[PDB]
Structure formats: C-alpha cells, structure tokens
C-alpha cells in the first residue's frame, strides 16, 4: 500500500562545499603518466552542494530536478539509502525508472509505476535479535514494463550501527542519448561530518539503455520498526542516522593527471581561475614566472549546432557506376552533379573496388562536408596504366588521353571489368590516342582524327611513310594477363565556389539560437561564439546574415612569480581605466598599460624583473 509519513520535523535546507570530488573516468582508454585536457560534464570544484540528513526524525526525501546528471555522495553506517526513482511525472502516466536494492537483490525496472505519495522500505523483533525487510511502499502498480533487470541474490545485514559513518558511496548519474550512465565508487571513511578532503577517481558502473525522459528524481530510504516504535504505520518508526550530498554537473573543461599505474590522481578545473586557465593552456602543473594572456575572461560554451542546406534528394551515383557501357579513354565521359546529398561511406566501403585513392582530402572527413559541384569522369583503360591516373604522373595516357592537374582535390576509383567488356576475338571498340603533335593541358578533351605526320612532306589525307592513323585500338580477351585486362576508371572532382553549396553530406540541421556561446557549424565551416542578428555567416535556411562575436572579451593579462615560488598572481586589464573584473580586490593601480590588481606599487625604482609595459616593472618580494 501507500501511507503518508507524519511526525517529521521540518528544517531549512543545508549547503556545503564540494572539495575536489566527483571525478570520474571520461572514457575507457588506458592512459599512464600523462596530462589530458578534456571537456565534458563535471561538477565544478568547490561548488555549493546540498546536504540532507537522517537522524527530530528529519526523514528527508524530496523530489529534485534531474537537469544534466546528478553527483550523489552518501555517508552511511547501516545502508539506510535503498535506491532511487527517476522520471518526469512519476504518476504512472510517464515511463519511470526504479533502481532499488532490497535485502535480496538489486532490481532495475523501467515501468509506468503508480508511485506512492511517500514511498519507503519499513524493515525488528525484541524476542529474537534479527532485522528483516517487512514494508515496501513504493508504487501502487506497474502496467507497462520495457526494461527489467534483477541482480544475483545476496543477504543484507540490515543491522543498525551505533558508530560513526563508515561507508562513503559516490555516484554519478547521466542521461545521454537515452543511455543512463552510472559511475560508482565506495570508500571506507572515519569521520563525524563534513565532506572529507583528498582525491578519488570514480569508475564506471553501468550503462543502461533505457531511452526514457528523466526530469525529476527521488531517493528511497529504509525504515526500522520494532517494539520501541509504537503507533500506526505513519508514526511507529524510526529513521536511522545517515547523510547525503547532492550536486549538479556542468559542461566544463578539466585537466586530468594519470600516474604510472594508469589511474587518475589529480584534477585541475580549466575555466576556474586565470592561474588555472594558464595551467590548462600550458598543459602542465607548474607555471614559471612571467606574463600570460590565454584567451579572455573564462567561459565554457553551452551547446553546439549544425546548419546545413536542406536537399533531401538522393544523389544519383548508381547511374554512373552501374552503367551499361563506358566511353573510350580518348573521348572520356563527363557528368556534372549538384543539388544532391551523397553518402560517401557506402561508396568507400562497397568492398568491390581495386583502387580507391583520395588526393588532398581525407577519405572519411569528406563525408560531412559541403561542395558546390561534383564532376564524374568515366572511361576504361588497361591495368598497367591505371597508376598513370595521378597528379604528376607521366606516360602515354597522362600525355595524350587524360591529363590531371597537379593541385588535384578529388578521388580516383578503379575496378576490374574482365567479365563485362571482354570477348573472344577482340573487343575492338576502345581506342586511344598514340601520336599527338603536342601535350595536353589539364582537363582537356580531343577527338580530332587527323592523320599524324612525322616527316617533312605533308600527306594529303593519305596514310603511308611518316603518316599514321592517330588512334590505336585496344584488344580485349578473357585470356589476357592481369596487366592487360580492362579496368573501369571513375574520377570524382570536387568544385568549391563562393556560391551557396549544392552538395552536402548527410547530417542534421539543429534549431539555431542567438545570444548564446555556441559551437556552430555552417555549411561545413565551424566556429564558436555568440550569434548576433544583423566574421559574418549567411545561414542556408533563411539567408539572414549573423555576426560572430567572440563571447567573452577584454584582453586579460596574468603576472606570476612561478608555481614553485608562490600562488600569488597579479591580474591586469589592458582596456580598463581605474568594471568587468573577476574581483576588485586591492592593490588597484592604474598605468598606461591598464589596471593592475594584486601587485603593490612602490615609490622606488629597481631593476626590471617582470616587464609589463610603458616602463612598468614588477617583482615578487616579502
């Protein structure tokens, strides 16, 4: 059933500080003795997290939002916490996830639970000293169930302890792409209260493919009932001392340190303080004395968007590749394609091509790009001369049939065709130029059939001495060697112009936003900053010019005497006349270079240790 717990004293919420906790492994790649800078959802250091107690009763279990993942620390001595519930409404109207740990198993279910108003687990007898699970008031019913998992059976102690908290359980919950990622860690502790200091790397625990909408969540605790708790179900119970800290993760950049054992030992917040930003930029834990300007005031952009022209037309590659016949090399087939979306991955991985070489462009990176035009040039050649279709190559084909420019920017595909256009007796339909007066300019076609003259005397359209037919004929048979079998060659050339792109890779166009620090991708070119309605980009969906403001601004300088010397630093604002500052502090001195904070100005004039500008020199003293 469900009962509303009463006789509970209400107290104002308490808050504490997160002393360098909530550090988990970003991935599953082994790194040893290395400093890795990576941006992801982490709890900022020394943040203000919320503290809840269980001891006045104070049986606190409110419903809290699940914004971007929750960091949950728990100080326990008797395993009062029993599990959690996540969802959107938690009233059986929306799909809800219950992760509970009873005295027997661990049950993870994703169902439309009709959750009780005050869910709890009221587990004792005087005559025999034994604690057993007795009450489970979580949900009225579950109608539709999608995911269900039960852990192996185990026996829980369920026994209360009169000592201090001995277990510290740290969990990180994230909901990314319908996947609930849980990172877990346990630590033996001996303390009275407050968050312990130190460092701890959180290891991944589970990645459940639930695929549900999670907005709110609640923690499920345990109750103890015996002869010492008289009354009804709503009053005849105790709480049991426990505590837990709750915090929210934010998208931040962190510098992680890996020791010789491959474990995480230290973490640095990158957009926390100017000293931290300098440490992150230098990718080291020690910074020498000097002046540094990393980027600007600290800021981590919120999201990322992509804006690509909308052309849902499947691009016709099957027309060219799967063609009945191909033209001769001396008269090679040209086709132009535009206003289409091309899936280059299937073409690259069709696993039926003898040669596939892309010049100037990475074979995989070209998938998500935008191009103005594409040219497909097709013909049939001999196996030996396929290598001649490449920039800077020389030969008969490269000088009389098909010339390729040195600064090529496309791809070349070629595959064997000995089963299609090879017949006994000789397929005398394919020709090729063998004698030409001059060379060929890049991307040139000639079909002239004038007889070539090599001698002094001109022959009047008649063959003979020093006069030959210009075009020779290939012969093809099913019994030639590999070097003489026919090969079908298709060259793709990508043309880029300032005109709006017509060919683009298969991607999404996410709704655009304004006045937000975002990582935008327009027509294949990426950038970061704030988009302002009006360097400037013309979006392909409404043809509206948007200006790119570099988010934070104001050239900020930092003076340090060395990490080993001291942590005291001086902050200089070069465009502020003494405003937009991290903190006004003290030692505010205005010079031609700007406003300096944290450095003492003296009436003397010593040798220049740390130059700043306009004849100003500073140093660190007692």
């Amino acid at each position: 059933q469900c009962v509303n717990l009463t006789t509970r004293t209400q107290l104002p919420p308490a808050y504490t500080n997160s002393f360098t906790r909530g550090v988990y492994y970003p991935d599953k790649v082994f790194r040893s003795s290395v400093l890795h800078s990576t941006q992801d959802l982490f709890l900022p250091f020394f943040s203000n997290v919320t503290w809840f107690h269980a001891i006045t009763k104070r049986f606190d279990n409110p419903v809290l939002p699940f914004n971007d993942g929750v960091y949950f620390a728990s100080t326990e001595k008797s395993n009062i916490i029993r599990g959690w519930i996540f969802g959107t409404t938690l009233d059986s109207k929306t799909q809800s996830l219950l992760i509970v740990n009873n005295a027997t198993n661990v049950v993870i279910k994703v169902c439309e639970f009709q959750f009780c108003n005050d869910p709890f687990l009221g587990v004792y007898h005087k005559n025999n000293k034994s604690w057993m699970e007795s009450e489970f008031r979580v949900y009225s019913s579950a109608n539709n169930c999608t995911f269900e998992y039960v852990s192996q059976p185990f026996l829980m102690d369920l026994e209360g302890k009169q000592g201090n908290f001995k277990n510290l359980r740290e969990f990180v919950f994230k909901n990314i792409d319908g996947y609930f990622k849980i990172y877990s860690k346990h630590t033996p502790i001996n303390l009275v209260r407050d968050l312990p200091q130190g460092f701890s790397a959180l290891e991944p625990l589970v990645d459940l493919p639930i695929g549900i909408n999670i907005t709110r969540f609640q923690t499920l605790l345990a109750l103890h009932r015996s002869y010492l708790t008289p009354g009804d179900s709503s009053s005849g119970w105790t709480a049991g001392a426990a505590a837990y800290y709750v915090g929210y993760l934010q998208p931040r950049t962190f510098l992680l340190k890996y020791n010789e054992n491959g474990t995480i030992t230290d973490a640095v917040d990158c957009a926390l303080d100017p000293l931290s930003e300098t440490k992150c930029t230098l990718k080291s834990f020690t910074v020498e004395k000097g002046i540094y300007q990393t980027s600007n005031f600290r800021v981590q952009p919120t999201e990322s968007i992509v804006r690509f022209p909308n052309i849902t037309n499947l691009c016709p590659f099957g027309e060219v590749f799967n063609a009945t016949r191909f033209a001769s090399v001396y008269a090679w087939n040209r086709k132009r394609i535009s206003n289409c979306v091309a899936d280059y991955s299937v073409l690259y991985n069709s696993a039926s091509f003898s040669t596939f070489k892309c010049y100037g462009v990475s074979p995989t990176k070209l998938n998500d790009l935008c191009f103005t035009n594409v040219y497909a040039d097709s013909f049939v050649i001999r196996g030996d001369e396929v290598r001649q279709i490449a920039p800077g190559q020389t030969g008969k084909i490269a000088d009389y049939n098909y010339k390729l420019p040195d600064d090529f920017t496309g791809c070349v595909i070629a595959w064997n065709s000995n089963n299609l256009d090879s017949k006994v007796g000789g397929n005398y339909n394919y020709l090729y130029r063998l004698f030409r007066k001059s060379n060929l300019k890049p991307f040139e076609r000639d079909i002239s059939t004038e007889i070539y003259q090599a001698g002094s005397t001109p022959c009047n359209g008649v063959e003979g001495f020093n006069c030959y037919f210009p075009l020779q004929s290939y012969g093809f048979q099913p019994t030639y060697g590999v070097g003489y079998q026919p090969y079908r060659v298709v060259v793709l050339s990508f043309e880029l112009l300032h005109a709006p792109a017509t060919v683009c890779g298969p991607k999404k166009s996410t709704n655009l936003v304004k006045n937000k620090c975002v990582n935008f991708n327009f027509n294949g070119l990426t950038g970061t900053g704030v988009l302002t309605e009006s360097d400037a980009v013309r979006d392909p969906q409404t043809l509206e010019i948007l200006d790119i403001t570099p988010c934070s601004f104001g050239g900020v300088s930092v003076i340090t005497p060395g990490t080993n010397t001291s942590n005291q630093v001086a902050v200089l604002y070069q465009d502020v006349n003494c405003w937009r500052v991290y903190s006004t502090g003290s030692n505010v001195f205005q010079t031609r270079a700007g406003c300096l904070i944290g450095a003492e100005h003296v009436n003397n004039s010593y040798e220049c240790d740390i130059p700043i500008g306009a004849g100003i020199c500073a140093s660190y003293q007692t």
């Binding site: 004698f435 090599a454 001495f465 020779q472 019994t479 060697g481």
Partner: protein
Amino acid sequence: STIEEQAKTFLDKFNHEAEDLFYQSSLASWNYNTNITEENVQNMNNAGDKWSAFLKEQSTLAQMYPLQEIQNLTVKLQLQALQQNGSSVLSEDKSKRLNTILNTMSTIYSTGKVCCLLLEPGLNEIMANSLDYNERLWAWESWRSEVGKQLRPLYEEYVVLKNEMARANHYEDYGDYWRGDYEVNGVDGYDYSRGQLIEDVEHTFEEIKPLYEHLHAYVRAKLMNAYPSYISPIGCLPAHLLGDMWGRFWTNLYSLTVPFGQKPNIDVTDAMVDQAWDAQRIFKEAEKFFVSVGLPNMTQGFWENSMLTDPGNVQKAVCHPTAWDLGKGDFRILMCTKVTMDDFLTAHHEMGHIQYDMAYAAQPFLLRNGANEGFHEAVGEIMSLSAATPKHLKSIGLLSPDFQEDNETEINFLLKQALTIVGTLPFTYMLEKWRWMVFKGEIPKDQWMKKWWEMKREIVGVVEPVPHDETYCDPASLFHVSNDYSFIRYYTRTLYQFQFQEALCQAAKHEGPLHKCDISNSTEAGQKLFNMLRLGKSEPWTLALENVVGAKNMNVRPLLNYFEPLFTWLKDQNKNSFVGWSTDWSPY
C-alpha cells in the same frame, strides 16, 4: 624531323599490332596443338600467312631508314634485327627451287624405310637394344644406303644455293651467316668478332681432351667383354656399337658399363605412387622451389589455361612438352604428366623456361629473347640440375627421412651423367667443323666422305664398320643436317650451364663437391640471377655473362671441376690399361 625521331615513331607503331598479330597466330597454334583437326589447321595456316606477310611488309618499309643516323644503341638493335632482307635476295625461281628442295628433304627424311621397318617405330629400338653385331650393322648400312645415297645431289644443290644467297647477303659464307649470331659491335671492352668464334672453341675442346680420352679408353676396355672378336685393344670404336643411330649420346651404353652395379640407382617412382601424387603436386613443388629461391609467383591464368595431363581418348593432341609464351601476359605449359622422376625433372625444366619468359616481358617486342641461342636451355637446365640432388629430395617427404649416401652411388651417378654430358661435345664439334668447312668450300665435292671419315677417326675416335664411296652422304642422315638447323648451340649450352652453376654455388655459400650443391633458400643467388634474367636481348651477351660469372668469355674449367672425382677414379682405373686410339686400325 631527325631520323632518330622517325625511327622511334615507326617502332612505336610497329610494336602495337605486332603484339596483336603474334598473339593471334600463337593462339591459333595452341588451339591446333591442343585440339587437332582440319579446321584448326586452316586457321593456323591463315594466321601464319598473315603474320609472315605483315613481317615482310614491315621489313620492306623499314629498309628505307639508314642505320648510320641512329645513335641510341637500342633502336639500332631493333632495326638491325628488322632490316633482314634474307631469302628475298634470291630469285623467285631460285626461291621456289630452294623451297622445293627443303620440302623434298623433309619428306624423304620423314618417309624412310629399309624393309615396313620405319625409323621411329623400331629402328631406334633396334639400335638401342639389338645387342647383335650383325643386326645392328645391317640396320646401319641399310639406313645409310636408303638415305645418304639418295640425298647427295639434293644436298649439293642446297649447298650451292645457300652459299650463293649468303654471299649475296654481304656475308663471306653461310657458316659466317650462322656465326653472325655470336656478334656484338659498338661496345668497348665487350665487342666480339665472327672470326673469333671459330677459335675459342677448339681451345676448350683441347682442354677437355684428356678427360674424353680416359673415358673413351675406359669404355673400350669395359666393352671388350661383349663382342670379343670385334673389339681391338687399340683403335677406334666401331660406329654402329654406340647404342645410337649416330652415336650422338651414350646413355644406352650405361646398362653395359657400370662401376658398382650392386648399388641401386636413385628412384622415387615407388614413393610417388605411395604418396599418390595427382599430376598437379609436381607443379606445386616446382612453384614452391622457384618461390623459395626468390623468384616471383605463377600467374592465375597459368593454372587454368594450361593443360597438364592427357585430355583423354575423346580428344587427341600431340603433347611433346613445351613452354608457351603467347604474349600479352599469357603463359602456358603443354605436357602429358605422368608419375615419374623424369617427369618431375622435365616439369622443373619447363617451369624454368616459363620463369625466364616472365623475367624480360617488360622489354619491347624485338628484344624478347635470350641473350643468344645458348642461354635459354642452360637457364632451363640448371634448375633441373639443382633439383636432382639427393639432398633436395630428402628435404621433400618423398625420400627416406633416414638415408645414407655412399661414394659408390655418387660414382655411378656421375658416370651416368657424364656418359651424356661429355659424350656429345666431340661429336658436336666435329660435325659443326665439317659443315663449316663444307660451306667454306675448302673440301672438294669429291672428298666429302673421305674428309668426314678422317675427321671421325681423328677427332671423335670412332671408325666405320665398312668403307663407303663418294656416292654415300652419311652426315645428311641427321635430322638437323637435312633440315637447315644450326647445331653449335648444343656445344656452348653445357659450358654456359656449368659456369652458371658454379657461380650460383659460390654465391650461395656452399661447401663440398659441386655435384652436391643446391641453391634453394638462397635469396642472394636469386637476386643475382634475376639481375641477368631481366636484361633480355637489350644488352650484349658478354655483359650479361659478366653479371653472373664475372668473366667476359666462357670457361670450361667448371666442367672439369664438376667431374674431377670421376676424373681421378678413371685415372686410377686406367693406370694399367692403355690410353689412346689407333688411327690406322680398321674393322676390315
């Protein structure tokens, strides 16, 4: 423009469609050989006529270009091989008469009886196994009377016609025309002269003279057991008692003369049968050996186009083993494979020929041949020599894993091999010298038989059983003599093959006697061999020879080193018997 540019353009035009016509003719010939029928005969004849007409037209057109202007030294070779007026010099009636003479010679050699009692089905069997003095003498005399007596005036007219043609071709004699093959010009330190070829042959022949003398004396001594009333203690051996119609080879004599007959010879027929080789494992082993040396693979088309067994009783086809280079990257092998050691060795030989053909395919059409006429068979034969060693057989599972070798078996094997390798050198030299002298005109038309038999008694050391007059023409009974075939190749082939074997054994870091040498698993030897194989005819043969052995000219010393233990054994055995022959002695 310049003559060189025009010549290059003409050659570029020629090679295209030269390859095409050659491929079509070769395909027709292969179809006829694999599938014998009248229609295939007509196709082959038409293709051959077309190819010949195209060659004549191209030669006529190329005659215009003067050779003096070309200075590229590669176009000049192709033009010189192309500017071959040749038989077109003779008059049309003269050409018809010459063709009729040659056709009549071929027909009369093919159609010969002494009965009934044809040459191939029974005459060779008698000459190899009769064992009767009277029967062998009768067959020899009957064949001589039936062939040489008839072929005298035809051969005389042929000689005068061919000598006239050679003289009209700006050549001193037809012998000079043949010897023009061993000629290289324009290279300092490598050039050769036609007159140098007549010398440098007798020198090495005299170098091996004591070995041949010892072998001949030993053979005479051993043969005295049979025909006691016909063998002289000193003198020349009777002509008909050589186990051959002409005595070119002494292999059949091996049965009579053995030093240690108790020791069995090496044979793997039983092992092949027990392991049940399916007439394809042989080629697999050959390919594996050639790969292990370091040479490339075998093309996929070779494994399906070529036929390596009898087609069956349904379809007939002559299957004298052959290695076919059809052009345009097509390679085939024609054999009737059976489970014998001889088939194993001949398969290795043909695979070697195929590898040699693969090596130089990148060269233009006019230069796709061996360095000279003697390189190709030597290259094909050194592979069989290397693969015939007992060590190589023991490496394969066919031979016994635990086998012991004794020097008696080594001596038996060396004697059997020497009965063929060295028994033909004096005969080849004598026959080619006689033909050269006949062509030169030194010998009068009434002294042919006398001079021929004098040379046979002196050089070869073999005497005729009965005298013959000037009516007879004994040397015309040979296949090569009557069919206009140059014959010096069978002399230099052995020299080249033994020089190559010595060079490879030295470069492969092997120790011991030369006859116990194998070159498998020797990448350096393979690379050195390829550095010569890939040359083709582009470079002078002297330079190609230097690229392996390191000597500009051929040396007979490696051959002597090969048979040195047998030389010592023969000297020890002949320390008591006489050495030499008596010229004056005759059977009658």
